[PDB]
Design a protein around this ligand. Structure first.
Ligand SMILES: CNC[C@@H](O)COc1ccc(Cl)c(-c2nc(-c3c(C)noc3C)c(C)c(N3CC4(CCN(C(=O)OC)CC4)C3)n2)c1
Ligand SMILES: CNC[C@@H](O)COc1ccc(Cl)c(-c2nc(-c3c(C)noc3C)c(C)c(N3CC4(CCN(C(=O)OC)CC4)C3)n2)c1
Ligand SMILES: Nc1ncnc2c1ncn2[C@@H]1O[C@H](CSCC[C@H](N)C(=O)O)[C@@H](O)[C@H]1O
Ligand SMILES: Nc1ncnc2c1ncn2[C@@H]1O[C@H](CSCC[C@H](N)C(=O)O)[C@@H](O)[C@H]1O
Lengths: 344, 344
């Protein structure tokens, strides 16, 4: 019985920690040079935030970020990891001669014991669309170990939302679902399921990158301040929007990306997953509208993106939007945990 | 609770039925024309095995195989399905005006109650490498409903294994593993994890197709007779082999494929996933040796492939092989549940 277990269906947790138990998965994240290189730079260039300090690494995986904290001179790093990756992290701490400075604690950060409070918490808890995984709440939970006035790296996260037009992506959903619109598939009329097939595809956020020319308005930003936020703040995330359209066309949905900032004593370093920046393993995420909206340049597209946390380590997404000048409206429900990994 | 839940981790079962509850997944199987067309032919060309008979469809999915039994004149078909796909199958039965003949029964075949015994059981229970999923055991379990001298479609299954040489595949996997050979990844020594990393990558069976020129010896065949086997026969599957090498070179592992036969009263119909036959959504499956074996034409490669059923709806594979002429041995352990889907 913990904060984690009460928040999470055991079946989801098992699958989740199995996934991170593979060295190939740790390797996928490590190999993202923009990510891993930026974390390293953020920590090393802010060396005074680490020199002789006590550090907590929330979800250490291979231990990579803890090693950077050590390169920056930290005195003691508690590296907490809930998957079977904890044993491999331990092998690396030993082989890198760091047993006196990095202590791997196997288990959930919501369940383990730390022997002292820490000066700074480091973590990479970001899912696709930022919020997938609900590991941001683990990272916030971890502040129970933080000395008053302690820091967190990353310090803040921004999600960006912007409307897009992408007629080809939109038409691809019907193309796929029209498999079911056959009156005699081997003698069987499949047609009655075509609607259900359309709904299935539209419920999947599309994880992939895209050309910035699809974007039809300046993005709106929603910020989580990790120093100030409480876990409960991530249970219901309401993002209102009021887009002033830069281009006329059919709006087929909303595009999402995120940035995080490491606000150190020496400098602020940003890690961005924006479509204007080099590609990362996070890509970007698009949520389609099953009913597209016509807008002309100068119109306002208003509505809300509401994310409601669920016990499958993710969110139910509800996007409602309207063009203010016409009143035409579109309402959409998506299951963040089960997206379309279109980049594959 | 049931035979099923006793042998199945809940976390595995949830993920498994979630996978099959997607229309897109049913479509993937349905669209395999060799598979679906062969099933239809097996059923329709053996019409006297269905005409005025009672049928059980184990894991009906969309209902496709039940429609084929109805086409062949079956009096009653019980279509059992444990995923949420059952609700879509009922929609199709109504829209195809077959409410009087196809009765969908939601639930596990191990847990439902059927109104009567059946003349014939149809299913498509084959996983990749035949044995993945442990659905063969559900199919065998279902014989509790089979009338004396009832039939099974498919009736028998043959797994084939043959040694192969494929330096490119071996090096592709080896190269991924050797990320963990780096002594200074961002200044961190990962090398102590090299052995673990090689073990992990080589533990993954490789699902994809290949040119038959890679095969180094005639296949060994192991047959499961579905009419005769008991579910317990599938807990421990031991396949000895003695290959008479036809070509000299490095044996990089064993290649696997399978055929099933529908042995009806009118004719036998074969469905094959062999690499000498048109490609199916099953592809083929290769288990690599991390330590390849050198063999000369005329040598014998002998050993055992042992499959031990596990609670994750799959098998722990051990392959021990040796070149008899030199005493060169290779021992390997593979996790069938977690393969490398190389064909993507
Ligand atoms: C704490 N966050 C750590 C971050 O570095 C993870 O960043 C990402 C970035 C992009 C993605 Cl697409 C993922 C990310 N997430 C999750 C995930 C997780 C975790 N929890 O729920 C879900 C869903 C999953 C499952 C995931 N992948 C499944 C995947 C794509 C489809 N596959 C495939 O085509 O193989 C044939 C199998 C491998 C990659 N990727 C993670
Ligand atoms: C009862 N057996 C029904 C048969 O029709 C299933 O036949 C196959 C044939 C080949 C594959 Cl490679 C699979 C088969 N199996 C299992 C499976 C299952 C089920 N239980 O444990 C496992 C593992 C899984 C997960 C699975 N896929 C994951 C996958 C990776 C590649 N994909 C992709 O790139 O785009 C989505 C699609 C999703 C394909 N495919 C099934
Ligand atoms: N509640 C929790 N407690 C402990 N570890 C957790 C956790 N939730 C997620 N994790 C772990 O956090 C890691 C996130 S992936 C990032 C790993 C590593 N810090 C890196 O930057 O490369 C995974 O290894 C996952 O198993
Ligand atoms: N123990 C069990 N009881 C009931 N259904 C099962 C089962 N194990 C697997 N299934 C179902 O069996 C189906 C196998 S896929 C084959 C679907 C369909 N008969 C066709 O040939 O196209 C899946 O839908 C899966 O959910």
């Amino acid at each position: 019985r913990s904060v984690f277990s009460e928040r999470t269906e055991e079946s989801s947790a098992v699958q989740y920690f199995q996934f991170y138990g593979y060295l190939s998965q740790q390797q996928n994240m490590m190999q993202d040079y923009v990510r891993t290189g930026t974390y390293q730079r953020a920590i090393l260039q802010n060396h005074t935030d680490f020199k002789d300090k006590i550090v907590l690494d929330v979800g250490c995986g291979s231990g990579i970020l803890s090693f950077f904290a050590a390169q920056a001179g930290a005195r003691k790093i508690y590296a907490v990891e809930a998957s079977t990756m904890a044993q491999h992290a331990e092998v690396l701490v030993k082989s890198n001669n760091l047993t006196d400075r990095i202590v791997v604690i196997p288990g959930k950060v919501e369940e383990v014991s730390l022997p002292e409070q820490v000066d700074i918490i480091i973590s990479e808890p970001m899912g696709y669309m930022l919020f997938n995984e609900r590991m941001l709440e683990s990272y916030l939970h971890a502040k129970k170990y933080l000395k008053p006035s302690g820091n967190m790296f990353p310090t803040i996260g921004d999600v960006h939302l912007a409307p897009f037009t992408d007629e080809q992506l939109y038409m691809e959903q019907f193309t796929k679902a029209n498999f079911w619109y056959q009156p005699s598939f081997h003698g069987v009329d499949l047609s009655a399921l075509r609607g259900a097939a359309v709904d299935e595809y539209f419920r999947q956020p599309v994880v992939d990158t895209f050309d910035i020319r699809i974007l039809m308005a300046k993005s709106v930003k929603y910020t989580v301040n990790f120093l100030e936020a409480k876990e409960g703040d991530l249970h219901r995330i309401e993002i209102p929007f009021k887009f002033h359209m830069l281009h006329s066309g059919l709006v087929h949905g909303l595009a999402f990306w995120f940035d995080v900032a490491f606000i150190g004593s020496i400098m602020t370093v940003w890690l961005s997953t924006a479509p204007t920046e080099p590609l990362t393993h996070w890509y970007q995420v698009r949520c389609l509208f099953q009913s597209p909206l016509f807008a002309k340049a100068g119109d306002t597209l208003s509505g809300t993106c509401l994310l409601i946390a669920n016990k499958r380590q993710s969110y139910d997404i509800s996007i409602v939007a309207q063009v203010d000048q016409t009143g035409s409206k579109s309402s959409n429900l998506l299951d963040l945990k089960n997206p379309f990994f279109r980049y594959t």
